[PDB]
């Protein structure tokens, strides 16, 4: 038993973390095979950060201008390209520690592990979620740019996120590994609307199943509800609307506990309308939405 | 900005995770140099788990009975010894991936990262704290025995915890790497008193400093307090008594924010006497005590 905000082991990812220096700026790069991926804002200076002409800024750059360092050994840059908002630097050596990897674009509400890095050195790892508004609530400081988010299935690392920017609101915005930002965000030091963020309902329901599995049952009740009635309650409390696909994904947890998904919806409806009344669920005084149904299954079954 | 329950990168630790099989039982081992450390309850069977005679059970065992597996390759056991509640199996090969390591016994209130493993395979990593009552609130399933807790300074892994047991209350008990349990716990399937657990006050104060550093200031007030007055409040709310040593350790965070430790104590006194009033601090509706002053400094400064 026990329920923690568990991240994937970062080992396979530490072996890809490099330091990228361009001009006066240093950020993190992801060395996979003979390519180093990093945020394109490495070619920028403070003056041009308000609205940079990335194509023009990259033109004044040659392979020898980009300095890629892997721990201590210098990598030789033989090619440079800009793919959306990332630079792909072809290096003459393939990373001996490259794991089996995929570049995947996650959906909002999905979770992943983040390995925060500074100067190519990892400092920590935390599990987080792609918010419905495409922001992430991470922990990032200056120099954390280039830190990646990922998921791990058996031996394959699916890279899903690269950190680029911190919004004035303190939340974080970044891209997939092909350079496409999640959300409407652009790599300019300009004020940007993060958007209205909602609560990932299916994740809160999955965490309620995780609570029952781990002994917390006080929130269970003699009531049930329909998808329609629950969705009216969810709309009032800024929760993502529940669909039959969400109910289907909660099938495994519903079968393990023997609690129908609409009976768990009725418990969540009561928790929303009445609050926690000073109590806790899994050590928390608020409803948690950063555990997908898959995360709860993995943690309560012990998939390695 | 941002404040997460960040764990150390698990890379250096994954390279030491082995699988130990003895008889019908399988648990995790820590392969450092030519020794594999694991919980001694690997030599037990269900019948003798109520009160095992470990000395007698180990006598019926020879080096060839212990099966140590590192990923896929089998290790050759040339020596076996029992040190308190851990077995030290001398293997003929030194772990090529052994990091610079220390075996340290942490104090209650200290934090560490845990790499949960099953069959020698890591599954996740989470940051947690040694509770004042010497239990840990981890996430462990059957087969998680042998999973270690650690801290990392530069390149040195300080191993501080080895998981042995889950108490009937769902909390976890384990040992240091010399086989000494933290707390009064023994490796027997017997009901054991976990003890009264208190809230690590200096950690809650450190997290309040982390809240101010990251924009959350609603809890700050026009009041101050003495060590004595604050300690009366802490006693009523089952918080660890604050000492001048705790105040001294909060010196760096007090200097960064410019908020005197006794003014932050007065804010905590109000939060305890009045609750959060439905609000949150760093995304939480309760007072957090699993971030030491060092953790807050590391996370808000970016030590790699
Ligand atoms: C300067 O202080 C910080 C603190 C925390 C930080 C956390 N994440 C990122 C940082 N910097 C940037 O976002 C730099 C930047 C600016 C505009 C557009 C783009 Cl793509 C990048 C951070 C800086
Ligand atoms: C059998 O199910 C579980 C579930 C979660 C579990 C989480 N941690 C540990 C487990 N097992 C034990 O503690 C085995 C045991 C028993 C008595 C004394 C000692 Cl030293 C060891 C777990 C078992």
DSSP assignment of A57-99 equals HHHT--GGGEEEEETTEEE-EEEEEEETTEEEEEESS--TT--
Is the same domain home to B203 and B295?
Answer: yes
Is the same domain home to A124 and A253?
Answer: no
Determine which one of A16, A38, A117, A145 is catalytic: A145
Give the number of other CB atoms < 10 A from CB of residue A249.
19
Instruction: Please check whether residue A289 is in contact with residue A207, taking contact to mean a CB–CB distance below 8 angstroms.
Output: yes
CA A134 from chain centre, in angstroms, equals 9
Angle between helices A227-236 and A261-274 (to 10 degrees): 30
Instruction: Please check whether residue B5 is in contact with residue B121, taking contact to mean a CB–CB distance below 8 angstroms.
Output: no
How many residues are given for chain A? Answer: 304
How many residues are given for chain B? Answer: 304
Instruction: Please check whether residue B109 is in contact with residue B123, taking contact to mean a CB–CB distance below 8 angstroms.
Output: no
Is the same domain home to B73 and B191?
Answer: no
Instruction: Please check whether residue A86 is in contact with residue A178, taking contact to mean a CB–CB distance below 8 angstroms.
Output: yes
**Per-residue b or e along A179-216, where b marks 16 or more CB atoms closer than 10 Å to that residue's CB:** bebbbebebbeeebebeeebbbbbbbbbbbbbbbbbeb
Give the CATH number for residue B248: 1.10.1840.10
For residues A54 and A62, give the distance between their C-alpha atoms in angstroms, rounded to a whole number.
14
Question: Does B199 contact A at CB distance below 8 Å?
Answer: no
Domain limits at B170?
1-14+100-197
> Pocket of ligand 2, candidates B166, B168, B186: which has the most ligand atoms within 8 Å of its Cβ, to mutate?
B166
Please give the structure tokens belonging to residue A287.
């409803």
- Beta-carbon separation of A139 and B11 below 8 A: no
Pick the closest to residue B140 from A290, A204, A214 (CA basis). Answer: A214
Instruction: Please check whether residue B112 is in contact with residue B151, taking contact to mean a CB–CB distance below 8 angstroms.
Output: yes
Name the domain boundary from A141, A171, A197.
A197
Query: A-contacting residues of B 97-136, CB under 8 Å?
Result: 115-119, 121-126, 128
Please give the structure tokens belonging to residue A31.
């060395």
For residues B286 and B204, give the distance between their C-alpha atoms in angstroms, rounded to a whole number.
10
Pick the closest to residue B37 from B129, B149, B134, B142 (CA basis). Answer: B149
The secondary structure of residue A150, as a DSSP letter, is E
How far apart are the CA of B167 and the nearest CA of chain A, in angstroms? 10
For residues A177 and A163, give the distance between their C-alpha atoms in angstroms, rounded to a whole number.
10
Angle between helices B201-213 and B261-274 (to 10 degrees): 100
Is the same domain home to A204 and A296?
Answer: yes
Question: Does B170 contact A at CB distance below 8 Å?
Answer: yes
Pick the closest to residue B270 from B235, B203, B222, B227 (CA basis). Answer: B222
Cα dist from B193 to A2, B144, B185, whole Å: 18, 22, 8
Name the domain boundary from B167, B197, B227.
B197
**Per-residue b or e along A146-175, where b marks 16 or more CB atoms closer than 10 Å to that residue's CB:** bbbbbbbeeeebbbbbbbbbbbeebbbbbb
- Residue B105 sits at the vertex; the CA angle it makes with B100 and B108, to the nearest 5 degrees, is 130
Cα dist from B70 to A155, A289, A304, B73, B201, whole Å: 16, 37, 15, 5, 41
- Beta-carbon separation of B285 and A283 below 8 A: no
Is the same domain home to A279 and A263?
Answer: yes
Is the same domain home to A2 and A134?
Answer: yes
> What is the phi/psi pair of residue A237, to 5°?
-100, 15
Strands B66-70 and B73-75: antiparallel
**Alpha helical stretches, state H, chain A:** 11-14, 54-59, 201-213, 227-236, 244-249, 251-257, 261-274, 293-301
**Alpha helical stretches, state H, chain B:** 11-14, 54-59, 201-213, 227-236, 244-249, 251-257, 261-274, 293-301
> What is the phi/psi pair of residue A141, to 5°?
-115, 180
- Beta-carbon separation of B10 and A11 below 8 A: yes
- Radius of gyration of chain B from its Cα atoms, rounded to whole angstroms: 22
**Is residue B186 lining ligand 2, measured as CB closer than 6 Å?**
no
How many alpha carbons lie under 13 Å from residue A258 in its C-beta half-sphere? 0
Strands B100-103 and B156-166: parallel
Residues of chain B found within 8 Å of residue A11, distances taken between Cβ atoms: 9-11, 14-15, 122
Instruction: Please check whether residue B9 is in contact with residue A124, taking contact to mean a CB–CB distance below 8 angstroms.
Output: yes
- Residue B144 sits at the vertex; the CA angle it makes with B142 and B147, to the nearest 5 degrees, is 165
Is the same domain home to B152 and B211?
Answer: no
Is the same domain home to B57 and B123?
Answer: no
For residues B266 and B253, give the distance between their C-alpha atoms in angstroms, rounded to a whole number.
16
For residues A295 and A137, give the distance between their C-alpha atoms in angstroms, rounded to a whole number.
18
Q: Is B170 exposed, middle or buried (0-12, 13-18, 19+ CB in 10 A)?
A: middle
Give the CATH number for residue A66: 2.40.10.10
Is the same domain home to B191 and B243?
Answer: no
| Method used experimentally | X-ray
Q: Is A56 exposed, middle or buried (0-12, 13-18, 19+ CB in 10 A)?
A: exposed
- Radius of gyration of chain A from its Cα atoms, rounded to whole angstroms: 22
**Is residue B113 lining ligand 2, measured as CB closer than 6 Å?**
no
Under 8 Å CB-to-CB from B77, ≥6 apart: which residues? B36, B63, B64, B66, B68, B89, B90, B91
> Maximum distance among all alpha carbons in chain B?
69
- Beta-carbon separation of B284 and A280 below 8 A: no
> What is the phi/psi pair of residue B96, to 5°?
-60, -25
**Per-residue b or e along B72-105, where b marks 16 or more CB atoms closer than 10 Å to that residue's CB:** eeebebeebebeebbbbbbbeeebebbbebeebe
Instruction: Please check whether residue B29 is in contact with residue B163, taking contact to mean a CB–CB distance below 8 angstroms.
Output: no
> Pocket of ligand 2, candidates B24, B47, B86, B165: which has the most ligand atoms within 8 Å of its Cβ, to mutate?
B165
- Cα(B165) to ligand 2 centroid in Å equals 5
Select from B124, B284, B304 the Cβ nearest to the Cβ of A7. Answer: B124
Q: Is B41 exposed, middle or buried (0-12, 13-18, 19+ CB in 10 A)?
A: buried
**Is residue B166 lining ligand 2, measured as CB closer than 6 Å?**
yes
Tell the residue nearest (CA) to atom 5 of ligand 1: A141
Is the same domain home to B190 and B215?
Answer: no
Q: What share of chain B is helix, strand, coil (3-state, %, to 5)?
A: 25, 30, 45
Query: Resolution to 1 decimal, in Å?
Result: 2.3
Is A41 among the residues known to form the active site?
Answer: yes
Query: Which of B1, B9, B155 is best to mutate for the A interface (most A CBs within 10 A)?
Result: B9
- Beta-carbon separation of A280 and B302 below 8 A: no
For residues A155 and B191, give the distance between their C-alpha atoms in angstroms, rounded to a whole number.
39
Judged by DSSP in three states, B12 sits in: helix
Is the same domain home to A90 and A36?
Answer: yes
For residues B137 and B293, give the distance between their C-alpha atoms in angstroms, rounded to a whole number.
20
Total domains, chain A? 3
Query: A-contacting residues of B 263-292, CB under 8 Å?
Result: 275-276, 278, 280, 283-286
Pick the closest to residue A20 from A58, A64, A69 (CA basis). Answer: A69
Give the number of other CB atoms < 10 A from CB of residue A38.
26
Name the domain boundary from A66, A99, A132.
A99
A275: nearest CA partner in chain B: B278
- Can you say whether residue B63 is alpha, beta or left, with left for phi > 0 and alpha for psi between -120 and 50 degrees? alpha
Q: Is B174 exposed, middle or buried (0-12, 13-18, 19+ CB in 10 A)?
A: buried
Which contacts (CB < 8 Å, 24+ apart) does range A46-49 have? Answer: A49/A188, A49/A189
Beta strands across the sheet bearing A35-39: A73-75, A66-70, A17-22, A25-32, A35-39, A86-91, A77-83
- Can you say whether residue A23 is alpha, beta or left, with left for phi > 0 and alpha for psi between -120 and 50 degrees? left
Instruction: Please check whether residue A102 is in contact with residue A158, taking contact to mean a CB–CB distance below 8 angstroms.
Output: yes
- Cα(B130) to ligand 1 centroid in Å equals 34
Cα dist from A119 to A31, A64, B6, B144, B145, whole Å: 14, 19, 18, 34, 36
For residues A99 and A154, give the distance between their C-alpha atoms in angstroms, rounded to a whole number.
11
For residues B21 and B89, give the distance between their C-alpha atoms in angstroms, rounded to a whole number.
12
For residues B29 and B88, give the distance between their C-alpha atoms in angstroms, rounded to a whole number.
9
For residues B41 and B191, give the distance between their C-alpha atoms in angstroms, rounded to a whole number.
17
Pocket, ligand 1, Cβ cutoff 6 A? A 41, 49, 140-142, 144-145, 164-166, 187-189; B 1
Is the same domain home to B162 and B250?
Answer: no
> Dihedral (C-alpha) A7, A198, B212, B137: value to the nearest 10 degrees?
-40
């Amino acid at each position: 038993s026990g329920f923690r905000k568990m991240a994937f082991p970062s080992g396979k990812v530490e072996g890809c973390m490099v330091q990228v220096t361009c001009g006066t700026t240093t950020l993190n790069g992801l060395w996979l095979d003979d390519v180093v991926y990093c945020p394109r804002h490495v070619i920028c200076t403070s003056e041009d950060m308000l609205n940079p002409n990335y194509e023009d800024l990259l033109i004044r750059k040659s392979n020898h201008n980009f300095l890629v360092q892997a721990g201590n050994v210098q990598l030789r840059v033989i090619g440079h390209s800009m793919q959306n908002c990332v630079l792909k630097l072809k290096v003459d050596t393939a990373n001996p520690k490259t794991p089996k990897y995929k570049f995947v674009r996650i959906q909002p509400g999905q979770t992943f592990s983040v390995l925060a890095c500074y100067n190519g050195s990892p400092s920590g790892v935390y599990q987080c979620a792609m918010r419905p508004n495409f922001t992430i609530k991470g922990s990032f400081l200056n120099g954390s740019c280039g830190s990646v988010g990922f998921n791990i299935d058996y031996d394959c690392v699916s890279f899903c996120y690269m950190h680029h920017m911190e919004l004035p609101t303190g939340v974080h915005a970044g891209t997939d590994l092909e350079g496409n930002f999640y959300g409407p965000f652009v790599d300019r030091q300009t004020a940007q609307a993060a958007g209205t963020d909602t609560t990932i309902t299916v994740n809160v329901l999955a965490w309620l199943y995780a609570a029952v599995i781990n002994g917390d049952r006080w929130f269970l009740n003699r009531f049930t509800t329909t998808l329609n009635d629950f969705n009216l309650v969810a709309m009032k409390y800024n929760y993502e609307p529940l669909t039959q696909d969400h109910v289907d994904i909660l099938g495994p947890l519903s079968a393990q506990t023997g609690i129908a998904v609409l009976d768990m919806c009725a418990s969540l409806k009561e928790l929303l309308q009445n609050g926690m009344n000073g109590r806790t669920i899994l050590g928390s005084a608020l409803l948690e939405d950063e555990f997908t149904p898959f995360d709860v299954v993995r943690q309560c079954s012990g998939v390695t």
